[PDB]
Structure 1
């Protein structure tokens, strides 16, 4: 359970992300695909992309980054009271997209890295630890839904 002070750190940096949702979404998905190429393979939509320059030039990838970060921002702003938001996301990611919980750990690392690069003044160690806790809570709750459905592993 995050404290109020931890949530304030999380949402303070997140409010900075929302000034350029699309640029953050590109940076995060590109970092994910470069650092963990198995993740790119899960996207029929993107797996034709073979270089970082091609990834950066894809408008469709930029659009999907906005989709992803809009969903995550709506979860973070619930401060843990996010059951309604996680139900459809766990269902699609477990049963349709077939995304292991481990790949959610990978995108969480990519999110933290990009926030540290773009917002160092608002993403000191206290805020890094709080965002790590928020993304851990996300993964914990998604993992419980995966386990219900028979996909935790």
Structure 2
């Protein structure tokens, strides 16, 4: 699949707003992910002990992790589809070390869309959401392909 320049513009326009507060968006996304799909928390040995949203918001380590995640995703989105190099290390670690199924990548994609919709309604109308969904679907499609090459069914 391929996004048009117009669709990429919608994606990068709202992403520019996210970048005004990377740490805050990361926390919101994780909290949404862990509350909606608790099973995903079990994959994080360093955070699986967190019991409440309050503890999650107070975790300095979780905040730092969120920044790393959004920074990596932002770098990929900014490549506008030409992300082969960026995807390699990410696919290898998540398939071989962390063992993250594609289903969980779908769950975090849902959390990202939920948070953007909540925080940036003016820059996340129907067309913008459609573009972001398309960008995330492309990301998941390419990661899934790499997973297969690496020997992980995902």
TM-score (norm 1): 0.99
Shift of 1:149: 1.6
Offset at 1:152?
A: 2.2
Instruction: Give me the whole-angstrom Cα distance separating, in 1, the residues matched to 2:47 and 2:53.
Output: 12
Matches of 1:124 and 1:58, distance apart in 2:
32
User: Within 2, Cα distance between the matches of 1:67 and 1:53?
Assistant: 21
Displacement of 1:151 after TM fit?
1.2
Unaligned residue ranges in structure 1 (runs of 5+) = none
| Distance across 1 between alignment mates of 2:150 and 2:35 | 30
Tell me how large the CA RMSD over aligned residues is: 0.6
C-alpha displacement at 1:69, in angstroms? 0.1
Structure 2: runs of 5 or more not aligned: none
1:15-39 CA distances to partner (integer Å, 9 max, x unpaired)? 0000000000000011111111110
Per-residue deviation, residues 81-108 of structure 1 (Å, max 9, x unmatched)? 0000000000000000000011000000
Q: Deviations over 1:47-91 (max 9, x none)?
A: 010101000111111100000000000000000000000000000
Give, in whole Å, the separation in 2 of the partners of 1:15 and 1:22: 14
SS at match of 1:41: helix
Partner of 1:96: 97
Q: Distance in 2 between matches of 1:64 and 1:148?
A: 27
Q: How many residues align?
A: 153
Alpha-carbon distance between aligned partners in 2 of 1:33 and 1:95, rounded to the nearest angstrom? 22
**Distance in 1 between residues matched to 2:153 and 2:87, nearest whole Å:** 15
For residues 45 and 90 of structure 1, the distance between their equivalents in structure 2, rounded to whole angstroms, comes to 20
* Mapped partners of 2:36, 2:85: distance in 1: 31
1:114 deviation in Å? Answer: 0.3
Cα deviation, residue 143, structure 1:
0.1
Using the alignment, how far apart are the partners of 1:104 and 1:90 within structure 2?
11
Deviating above 4 A after TM superposition, structure 1's stretches of 4 or more consecutive aligned residues are none
When the two structures are superposed, what TM-score results if normalisation uses the length of structure 2? Answer: 0.98
